[PDB]
């Protein structure tokens, strides 16, 4: 049940709010609207200038208690306890957890903020919206130009120039060509700025020789048209994932091919003859059916009834920190940001409060970092834990606090703040005994599990240890000892370099350990500027809770945010079958394919890109793969483009990954960069789900938010793996009649000559 983003009539027609601010203490009455497609939240502020917030840039919406209150006495005088706070709405947007802008509104009408807060949140977290078609993102760009209008309601030409600021001389020529106004000083009537005319403008702006090359490839030398059969055969042969079953995923019928033409083909002459022109074909390529991924991968479609140890879990390290380890702010907000982003394991370094209050507070190992009270963090966790994901959240305490009284306070705080959500005693089905497996995420939906010692860190008391059950941390002796004990509720943490040691020396024992119990991994102390280790290193040996610094968006975190988007942003990813089964065992360092595991081969050819930079600069694209050490390559790179950034085309050889031993663990990273190294955008795609054929890859920022204009056209072939020597055998299994028919003919021809 993944419905598309729907904008209720209230949000369309609009509601009256007063937008206020704490910085400049500004107060302005505005009308909030959201466009029918749900792309932009937009309002008209001072005089008549139209402001827009991109909904995909929203990280959270808040109301009532959780809304940011006006502490300034001047603003508060214009407003006014319970009912005044009840109609507050705070919108939190930003490109990453650390860099968040807060926009505050208060409705004039009663219980309006409650609706707007909830409805914006649904639009923001909508899955189809974030994974929209290429065309839909171009329609979003169109919508922006139509909203951001001058005071007299017209679309100024300079906004169109700003949006495509690279080659502004070509932009003017395209505008002139459509009979539109093209001088910088003038503006266009919305009446006259049709979506069809916008599309016509984009076609005259960007010439597409790459799409011409593709039409000629697909049996159309008489090129301006393409028949129903040619289209259908193209979709069934080139655009289809060959790994998929013909029954589960049936091929396109001619009746369906017709419906595609009705949808995309603009020219009536081609439609009635059952054909598709370049304009229809170019539309289909960026359409809703020809996405690079299937909806199953993005949907919450994974089995969630397996034991907790059988999943990779999204994990944070010293969540509270916004920058470095030694110096910087400790934020309560970071807990909200992590949990909203799908993190299911957050770390709390609790310390002993001073004599007057004696309130436990969170901070780093008594460094030059600021402090935040524990009460506020727990309250922020409850607020956001199950907002984007219903599956359990583990609280990783690094408990100091060496006083029984403050220990009982924090245990009491957990009880009262979380309520029923806190798991305090074990479930009936899963007793804390030897041989009993860990409960499933399904069994623990909407539950807070505490992870703290019982009986460096400080010892526990009767109040704090009694909350611990399925996730008890213990000092790791060895894999021999863990196997001897046979207890799934015990777990151990590993510092990066100790985890690296066990990885290189006892990889297989580690995978066998992680079948039954949990292992958490965190970075070493040396990483004082909050650097991250490649998490893939330990996912390869089955480690579930690979913790990272969410404030730092290096490649490590980009990968983490990318892979955890899948399975409905639940925060849990199911491990490969052979890393979960007790009766199986493979070496993580295999250079050769494993029996029982279907390997894959991948072909990635980078064809072209669009609107990649806002200025004229050369661009190159990296194509990496992450997974097992054998599967990992990351030297592939296109030649830097010619200086073109509107529509650069690469005449490039394909990037082959001929043997993916364990594809269900393999993630392909496509990342675009300007000449000089500046990041443009990227995308993480699971190798097992990626489609074959020509597809647009709409790019994302470092934090995995979808960029609107930047996009790449790529050709892919993801097939099941076949070794060289054993290729003739494969062809015969796939089509045995042809082969056996030939052999039976040969024998039939020898009938007379053999005689007897």
């Amino acid at each position: 049940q993944l419905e598309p983003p729907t904008v209720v009539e209230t949000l369309r027609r609009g509601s009256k709010f007063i937008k206020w601010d704490e910085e400049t203490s500004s107060r302005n009455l505005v009308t909030l609207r959201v466009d029918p497609n749900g792309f932009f939240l937009y309002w008209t502020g001072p005089n008549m200038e139209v402001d827009t917030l991109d909904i995909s840039s929203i990280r959270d919406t808040r109301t009532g208690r959780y809304a940011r209150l006006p502490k300034d006495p001047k603003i508060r005088e214009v407003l006014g306890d319970a009912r005044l706070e009840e109609k507050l709405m705070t919108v939190v947007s930003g490109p990453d957890p650390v860099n968040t802008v807060f926009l505050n509104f208060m409705a004039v009408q009663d219980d309006t903020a409650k609706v707007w807060s909830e409805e914006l949140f649904k639009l923001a977290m909508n899955i189809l919206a974030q994974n929209a078609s290429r065309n839909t993102f171009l329609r979003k760009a169109y919508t922006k130009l139509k909203l951001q209008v001058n005071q007299d309601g017209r679309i100024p030409v300079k906004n169109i120039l700003k949006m495509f600021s690279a080659d502004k001389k070509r932009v003017e020529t395209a505008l002139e060509s459509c009979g539109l106004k093209f001088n910088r000083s003038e503006s266009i009537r919305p009446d006259e700025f049709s979506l069809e005319i916008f599309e016509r403008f984009l076609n005259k702006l960007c010439l597409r020789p790459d799409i011409d090359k593709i039409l000629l490839e697909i049996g159309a030398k008489g090129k301006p048209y393409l028949t129903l059969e040619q289209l259908m055969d193209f979709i069934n042969q080139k655009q289809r994932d060959p790994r998929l079953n013909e029954v589960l995923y049936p091929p396109l019928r001619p009746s369906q091919a017709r419906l595609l033409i009705e949808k995309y083909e603009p020219n009536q002459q081609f439609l009635e003859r059952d054909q598709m022109s370049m304009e229809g074909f170019s539309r289909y390529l960026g359409g809703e059916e020809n996405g690079i991924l299937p909806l199953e991968a993005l949907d919450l479609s994974t089995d969630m009834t397996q034991p907790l140890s059988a999943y990779f879990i999204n994990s944070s390290h010293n969540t509270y920190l916004t920058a470095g380890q030694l110096a910087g702010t400790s934020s309560v907000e970071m807990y909200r940001q992590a949990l909203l982003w799908g993190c299911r394991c957050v770390e709390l370094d609790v310390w002993k409060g001073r004599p007057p209050e004696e309130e436990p507070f969170i901070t780093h190992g008594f460094t030059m970092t600021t402090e935040v009270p524990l009460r506020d963090v727990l309250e922020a966790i409850a607020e956001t834990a199950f907002k984007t994901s219903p599956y359990p959240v583990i609280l990783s305490f690094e408990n100091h606090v060496d006083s029984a009284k403050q220990q009982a306070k924090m245990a009491e705080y957990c009880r009262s703040i979380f309520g029923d959500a806190l798991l305090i005693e074990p479930l009936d089905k899963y007793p804390l005994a030897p041989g009993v497996p860990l409960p499933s995420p399904q069994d623990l939906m909407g539950r807070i599990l505490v992870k703290n010692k019982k009986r460096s860190e400080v010892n526990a008391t009767e109040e704090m240890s009694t909350l611990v059950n399925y996730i008890e941390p213990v000092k790791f002796k060895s894999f021999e000892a863990a196997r001897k004990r046979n207890k799934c509720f015990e777990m151990s943490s590993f510092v990066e370099t100790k985890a690296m040691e066990q990885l290189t020396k006892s990889p297989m024992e580690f995978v066998e350990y992680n079948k039954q119990q949990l292992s958490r991994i965190y970075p070493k102390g040396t990483r004082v500027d909050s650097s991250n280790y490649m998490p893939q290193l330990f996912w390869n040996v089955g480690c579930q809770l690979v913790a990272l610094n969410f404030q730092t968006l290096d490649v490590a975190m980009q990968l983490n945010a990318g892979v955890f988007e899948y399975n409905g942003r639940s925060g849990y990813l199911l491990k490969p079958e052979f890393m979960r089964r007790p009766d199986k065992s493979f070496d993580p360092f295999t250079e050769v394919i494993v029996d029982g595991i279907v390997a894959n081969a991948l072909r990635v050819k980078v064809i072209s890109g669009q609107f990649l930079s806002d200025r004229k600069v050369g661009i190159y694209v990296e194509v990496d793969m992450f997974g097992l050490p054998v599967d990992t390559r990351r030297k592939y790179r296109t030649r830097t483009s010619q200086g073109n950034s509107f529509n650069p085309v690469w005449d490039e050889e394909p990037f082959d990954f001929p043997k993916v031993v364990l594809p269900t663990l393999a993630s392909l990273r496509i990342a675009a960069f300007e000449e000089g190294g500046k990041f443009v955008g990227h995308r993480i795609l699971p190798v097992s789900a990626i489609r074959s054929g020509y597809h647009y890859v709409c790019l994302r920022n470092e934090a995995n938010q979808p960029l609107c204009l930047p996009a790449l056209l790529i050709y892919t072939e993801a097939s099941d793996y076949i070794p060289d020597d054993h290729q003739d055998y494969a062809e015969a299994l796939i089509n045995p009649i042809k082969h056996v028919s030939l052999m039976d003919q040969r024998a039939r021809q020898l009938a007379a000559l053999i005689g007897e």
Partner: protein
């Protein structure tokens, strides 16, 4: 303890997965009442799939609905998305019962050969009252009859007394057979399944080629492979009960004209088919142990696999 690896190979819908379930019933853990509830949804979906296939075949083959009021029922049922079905209530129960009762739909069922329709359709549709029941719990036969397309490669270990059999289930469709090479290491024995009933049908993946022609060609190819030099080859000629039914009105002569035996005789027909598979293979020199099976029949497979157990252990 000794562990031996067997492959369940065959073309699509031959019965590979149904055999696995009998292994689970006989040698494995069997199906508790809890496990059986897991199939309730799958049974509902099988019924919707089957009737949708027949509703589409009324158009394809130009068969009129006998009774006028079933057109509205047909339109109700065709619009359903089978993937989101989790219950079998009205108006869909009465709609499907009314359609199944229509002489036009019955004539369309008679001509199921001319399109793709699952073989457990009659089994379920004659038993709608039992399934439609609000407190319905699938029987063990219901679970054996259910149709769930296999994809990829799944190994099932079974603990028999003297040995552990690690049996590998695979998908039978053409695209699936590209994956098969990834389960060919260290194979003790191949167990090839063949639908005896498929002699007059055509493939789902290629609606111009004979199903048995594929099964024959696949078998005669696969047994000559380097991986199986020291492997035994058991041949299960499955669905013998459906052959008994079909051979009365669908003549084997009309699809394999080299058959010179009499019409309406299952024994003669199945023995000819066995001959097509095993006889005259220039490349193959190994003995083939055939058995005529009905994979949905637990007592048949208990007897049959007891013999195959003895044969495999003997050789290894």
């Amino acid at each position: 303890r000794r562990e031996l690896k067997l492959l369940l190979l065959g073309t699509g819908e031959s019965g590979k997965s149904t055999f696995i379930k009998q292994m689970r019933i006989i040698h494995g853990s069997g199906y508790s009442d809890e496990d059986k509830r897991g199939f309730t949804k799958l049974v509902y979906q099988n019924i919707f799939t089957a009737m949708q296939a027949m509703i589409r075949a009324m158009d394809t083959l130009k068969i009129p609905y006998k009774y006028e009021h079933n057109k509205a029922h047909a339109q109700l049922v065709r619009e359903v998305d089978v993937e989101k079905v989790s219950a079998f209530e009205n108006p869909y129960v009465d709609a499907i019962k009314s359609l199944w009762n229509d002489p036009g739909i019955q004539e369309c069922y008679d001509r199921r050969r001319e399109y793709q329709l699952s073989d457990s359709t009659k089994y379920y549709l004659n038993d709608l009252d039992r399934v439609a029941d609000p407190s319905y719990l699938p029987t063990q036969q219901d679970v054996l009859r259910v149709r769930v397309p296999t994809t990829g490669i799944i190994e099932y270990p079974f603990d028999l007394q003297s040995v552990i059999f690690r049996m590998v289930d695979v998908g039978g469709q053409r695209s699936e057979r590209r994956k098969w090479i990834h389960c060919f290491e260290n194979v003790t024995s191949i167990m090839f399944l063949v639908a005896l009933s498929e002699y007059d049908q055509v493939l789902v993946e290629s609606d111009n080629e004979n199903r048995m022609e594929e099964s024959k060609a696949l078998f005669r190819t696969i047994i000559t492979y380097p991986w199986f030099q020291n492997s035994s080859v058991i041949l299960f000629l499955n669905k013998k009960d459906l052959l008994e039914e079909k051979i009365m009105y669908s003549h084997l002569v009309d699809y394999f004209p080299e058959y010179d035996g009499p019409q309406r005789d299952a024994q003669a027909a199945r023995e000819f088919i066995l001959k097509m598979f095993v006889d005259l293979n220039p490349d193959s020199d190994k003995i083939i142990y055939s058995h005529f099976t009905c994979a949905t029949d637990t007592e048949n497979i208990r007897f049959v696999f007891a013999a195959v157990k003895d044969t495999i252990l003997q050789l290894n």
